[PDB]
Design a binder for these strands. Structure first.
Ligand SMILES: [Mg+2]
Length: 757
RNA sequence: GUGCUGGCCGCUCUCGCUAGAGGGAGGUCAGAGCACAUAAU
């Protein structure tokens, strides 16, 4: 229970023979990574033609046999034990030091380094080599796995709709339009009704009239989107290069040195500078950073003890904000890293490991993530916890819930195999959206509409047609130096740019106070990128935007962890939503996990199916109000109820977390969760299902491949689910008076959603 | 210590011109509070 972290200090001065040491290490690394990589049969794409060609692993094997000759097997074992790593690889730096697998191949190939007489030099050299090769092997395997899975996804999805949409795409490319989901959807929609005046889309609807496209018009809204997704996925699959790039080798790599026999370095912190004193290669003077504020270090037999605390960098001299100092941080240091960035400045890195209680992480690992917690875990659970849940959305960024649970305690809630609980802080919204979230949607809408206008401009002028009155009227509202159909596109690009730039300045002056207000600016900027990118292709028929996204993810992860500081576990829905695709589906969860892990708090990911449609109290199905997304409607006991969508989602996430997500929402006619559900709710798991009454399902110890839904303690068929959602819909269409039900009320006897016991 | 900000000013490239709009280096003047696990992709 030591969490790894790192940060950098800038190196001001140097003494002794330091630069010679660094240059020799980097040159030997560059020379020998090449040889030890081409020892590995790795496929790669040539960088000299943007990956147009490549080298197959069979060609790589032939070249390897050409180079090594009679020493293939020994190098195979050496490189295998290098990639595996660990203690066996910790005493095998013999590849360069003149004084065990790497020892004998030197006598067979005669490889030597710049300083074969310096044990530390060779130690760091092979450490850098092994780290650089390991950073690439993992990426290579995950790349091949992803390409295979992404191909097999297309190989399993074939239908007449897919081929017909492929033909439609080829026809559109011949007409120079390019196929998108919006055009496909709206053209299918408008093909059914004959047109009167020219429309924002005309070529597509005109070309959809012919009988060859009769298959599209008779297809189901579910199959059409599936065919479109398959077509786009196949396009990317045929655009992606075969193999990963072989790593760039002229660039410099970070050099690790520590106290464990790799070398000698002593850290002593004084009033003005930090000093690192290598015994023979000189000493380095480093300035103080606000990250390691009030830094103190003390020697220990095989470690260092750092005692620092974060501060605020007020680079402004006449700062107007009161300086604040974060809490003390007790960290352990084992190694340091030295590197030269391309700008020409050295940096010193301090990888420090934190100490925290392992109990919370063990609790969130084996108990709340398993349907079978073995008996020693229950006997090892405490008698008290505070838990929380969060629902992440573009609007109402975080909707948190706090609850207190414990064995031997009574409350409305229920925790599987543990006991009951009650709410501490009622379901609510952590922070309402700022005033500028509304104005940062119109901009993105304008950008995307401009993209579509350019897309139809290409085809219309290729065909010698006349632009529809809608686009011409839409682009005429903005001042332009002329009236041509091409001038009024850039005369609108020049307005979107100014609006986005004014937002960028004004929100940066404040340090990006609101969060859901900056997540909208990120969408606006992402859409503007693709507007400009498509702009410079009309004939051909940055890291400052990927850093704002990183900052926004870190701010979101900090906003979450600040609220649940006193909690022990937090529940999040398994996001493999308009916000998860904006930041990332894989890194936003990683950043949230890191932020919570910083404070010794666990995190548990629960199934996301149906957590926004059930009734938390009664467990019945509800119909989400399409007109107003923030309200969800139910129908219990001849009365219609209304509830807050975000609070319903948070409570359902909490209920699924407290139930380990073992109660399903839908299943075909299984897995561990549904097996345990059938074992507990009903007699056994290996049981057939038979329909009875009118939409109800009786479990008899028939139907196959059907939707069976859990609602109120009984399974229903797909038709009866649609009937219920219809019942409710109709009830709200005749204005029936609903009731307002609050989840934080203390008069609730129980919560039954996702509760099968 | 690292990251994220526009305004203006010449130069230099890519498409169009009933017309300009975007890209890359550099100069200069203002802004500047709140996050950090670093390397790569
Ligand atoms: Mg939700």
């Amino acid at each position: 229970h030591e969490i790894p972290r790192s940060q950098l200090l800038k190196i001001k001065q140097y003494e002794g023979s330091f630069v010679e040491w660094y240059r020799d290490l980097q040159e030997d690394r560059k020379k020998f990574a090449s040889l030890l990589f081409r020892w590995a049969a790795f496929g790669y794409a040539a960088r000299e033609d943007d990956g147009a060609t490549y080298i197959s692993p069979s060609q790589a094997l032939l070249e390897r046999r050409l180079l090594l000759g009679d020493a293939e097997d020994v190098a195979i074992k050496f490189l295998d034990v290098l990639f595996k790593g660990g203690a066996p690889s910790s005493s095998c730096y013999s590849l360069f030091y003149e004084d065990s697998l790497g020892k004998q191949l030197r006598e067979r190939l005669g490889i030597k380094c710049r300083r074969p007489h310096d044990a530390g030099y060779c130690k760091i050299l092979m450490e850098v080599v092994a780290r650089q090769l390991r950073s690439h092997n993992e990426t290579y395997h995950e790349y091949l796995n992803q390409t295979h899975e992404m191909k097999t996804k297309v190989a399993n999805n074939l239908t007449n709709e897919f081929d017909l949409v492929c033909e439609f795409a080829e026809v559109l490319e011949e007409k120079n339009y390019g196929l998108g989901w919006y055009v496909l959807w709206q053209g299918v929609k408008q093909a059914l009704k004959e047109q009167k005046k020219p429309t924002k889309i005309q070529i597509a609807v005109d070309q959809l009239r012919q009988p060859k496209f009769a298959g599209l018009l008779t297809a189901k809204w579910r199959a059409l989107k599936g065919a479109y997704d398959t077509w786009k996925l196949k396009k990317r699959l045929e655009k992606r290069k075969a193999f990963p790039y072989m790593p760039n080798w002229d660039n410099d790599y970070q050099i690790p040195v520590g106290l464990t026999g790799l070398g000698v370095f002593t850290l002593e912190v004084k009033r003005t500078e930090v000093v690192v004193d290598l015994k023979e290669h000189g000493k380095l003077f480093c300035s103080h950073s606000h990250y390691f504020g009030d830094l103190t270090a003390e020697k220990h037999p095989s470690r260092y003890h750092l005692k620092f605390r974060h501060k605020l960098k007020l680079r402004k001299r006449d700062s107007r904000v009161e300086p604040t100092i974060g809490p003390w941080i007790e960290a352990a240091l084992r190694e340091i890293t030295i590197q030269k960035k391309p700008n020409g400045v050295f940096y010193l890195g301090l990888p420090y490991a934190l100490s925290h209680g392992i109990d919370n992480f063990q609790i969130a690992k084996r108990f709340f993530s398993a349907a079978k917690p073995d008996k020693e875990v229950i006997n090892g659970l405490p008698s008290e916890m505070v838990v929380g849940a969060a629902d992440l959305n573009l609007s109402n960024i975080v909707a948190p819930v706090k609850a207190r649970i414990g064995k031997g305690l009574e409350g409305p809630l229920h925790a599987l195999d543990y006991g009951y609980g009650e709410l501490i802080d009622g379901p609510k919204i952590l922070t309402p959206d700022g005033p500028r979230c509304g104005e940062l949607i119109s901009l993105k809408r304008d950008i995307v509409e401009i993209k579509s206008a350019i897309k139809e401009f290409k085809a219309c002028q290729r065909e010698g047609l006349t632009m529809s009155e809608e686009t011409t009227t839409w682009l005429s509202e903005v001042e332009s130096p002329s009236d041509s159909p091409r001038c009024m596109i850039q005369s609108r690009i020049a307005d979107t740019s100014r609006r986005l730039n004014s937002f960028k300045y004004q929100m940066n002056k404040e340090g990006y106070q609101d969060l859901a207000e900056a997540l909208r600016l990120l969408d606006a900027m992402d859409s503007y990128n693709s507007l400009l990118e498509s702009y410079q292709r009309m004939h051909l028929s940055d890291t400052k935007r990927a850093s704002f996204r990183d900052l926004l993810r870190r701010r979101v992860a900090h906003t979450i962890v600040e609220y649940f500081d006193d909690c022990d576990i937090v529940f999040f829905e398994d996001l493999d939503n308009a916000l998860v695709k904006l930041l990332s589906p894989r890194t936003l969860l990683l950043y949230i996990r890191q932020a919570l892990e910083k404070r010794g708090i666990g995190m548990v990911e629960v199934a996301k199916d149906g957590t926004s449609q059930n009734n938390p109290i009664s467990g019945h199905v509800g119909w989400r109000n399409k007109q107003n997304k923030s309200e969800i409607y139910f129908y219990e006991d001849k009365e219609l109820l209304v509830m807050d969508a975000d609070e319903v989602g948070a409570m359902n996430i909490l209920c699924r977390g407290l139930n380990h997500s073992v109660c399903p929402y839908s299943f075909v006619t299984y897995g561990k969760r549904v097996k345990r559900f059938l074992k507990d709710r009903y007699g056994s798991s290996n049981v057939r299902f038979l329909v009875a009454s009118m939409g109800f399902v009786t479990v008899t110890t028939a139907l196959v491949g059907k939707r069976l839904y859990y609602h109120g303690g009984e399974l229903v068929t797909h038709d009866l689910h649609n009937r219920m959602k219809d019942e409710i819909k109709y009830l709200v269409e005749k204005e029936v008076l609903a009731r307002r039900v609050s989840l934080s009320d203390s008069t609730i006897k129980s919560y039954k959603s996702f509760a099968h016991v």
